[PDB]
Amino acid sequence: GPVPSRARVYTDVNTHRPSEYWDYESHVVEWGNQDDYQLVRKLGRGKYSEVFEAINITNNEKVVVKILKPVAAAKIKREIKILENLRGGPNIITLADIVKDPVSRTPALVFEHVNNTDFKQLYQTLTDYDIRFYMYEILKALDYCHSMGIMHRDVKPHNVMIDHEHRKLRLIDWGLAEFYHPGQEYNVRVASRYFKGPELLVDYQMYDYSLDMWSLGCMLASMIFRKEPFFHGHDNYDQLVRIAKVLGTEDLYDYIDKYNIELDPRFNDILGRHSRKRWERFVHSENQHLVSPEALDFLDKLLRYDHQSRLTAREAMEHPYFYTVV
Numbered sequence: 001g002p003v004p005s006r007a008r009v010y011t012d013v014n015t016h017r018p019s020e021y022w023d024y025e026s027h028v029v030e031w032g033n034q035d036d037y038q039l040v041r042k043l044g045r046g047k048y049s050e051v052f053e054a055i056n057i058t059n060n061e062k063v064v065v066k067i068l069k070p071v072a073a074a075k076i077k078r079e080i081k082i083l084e085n086l087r088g089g090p091n092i093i094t095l096a097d098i099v100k101d102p103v104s105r106t107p108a109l110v111f112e113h114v115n116n117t118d119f120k121q122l123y124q125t126l127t128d129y130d131i132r133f134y135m136y137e138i139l140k141a142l143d144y145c146h147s148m149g150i151m152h153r154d155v156k157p158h159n160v161m162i163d164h165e166h167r168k169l170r171l172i173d174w175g176l177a178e179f180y181h182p183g184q185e186y187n188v189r190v191a192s193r194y195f196k197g198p199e200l201l202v203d204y205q206m207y208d209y210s211l212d213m214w215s216l217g218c219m220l221a222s223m224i225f226r227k228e229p230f231f232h233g234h235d236n237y238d239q240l241v242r243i244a245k246v247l248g249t250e251d252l253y254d255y256i257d258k259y260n261i262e263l264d265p266r267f268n269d270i271l272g273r274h275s276r277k278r279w280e281r282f283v284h285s286e287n288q289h290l291v292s293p294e295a296l297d298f299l300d301k302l303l304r305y306d307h308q309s310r311l312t313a314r315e316a317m318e319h320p321y322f323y324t325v326v
């Protein structure tokens, strides 16, 4: 069977804490007043919620209301506990209230408002300096949540809200987040296709905070190379082949051999044999001003098959790529 794995940082952060911190099932939700909020417009609808722009009538301030779909109780308590645990942390969205929606009869989470723009609206037009600046801001959020024993598991441009005018960033949508417990096997059906780490794609369940670092590398590659998405898979299987056409198949086999993982046999007819490509293959006249030797070295240290070999969030903050950032 598979070889076990453990995070190389923040391994035992939950083990030493009282059960109150991480046992979300036992958490008692403190309800606010639903009449304090007036819904203004629907922003979007996903698999588990409907999101609205609203106004807090007690202070005339703009807020965002996420009304959860009646799909599951466990997911709701987990998200609430995580948001309350991380509240006030650097670049973490602030949960302002939790009210019972009168129509859906489900919880409605009330958040601070950032801007009607997600990072996906801006990330393909930033300057070199702004890519470094905002990447450093995302790292502050990731090191904080990892230091608090939490993995986000859905890092992607849509989950980074940016107020470009005020140079402010928030990491949102903690609905897939989980507490890291060493030796725990987790569900691999997390993160969006293009940002899924190889551990999810090869069905390795004992993953950790390092999954968020792969997703962050995918965002960086997309920004510096002006290729969205960087790894453009047609489904979860082709997603791994797209990665192997860049990182090569030999390092993929070394990864699965290290953890004694057996690839799904469906890969026998689609994976092939691919050499590792040099990062310079992705540089062209249109993205060259975003590429530097420091950006390429940093990217190379995030996009590694072996989750234990990737930079941690704190090591990433130490990288030369960020030396120019004030």
Ligand SMILES: COc1cc(CC(=O)O)ccc1O
Binding pocket: 043, 051, 064, 066, 093, 111, 112, 113, 114, 115, 116, 161, 172, 173, 174, 175
């Ligand atoms: C679209 O803006 C926001 C979206 C969300 C949604 C979430 O955290 O799941 C929270 C706060 C926001 O400001």
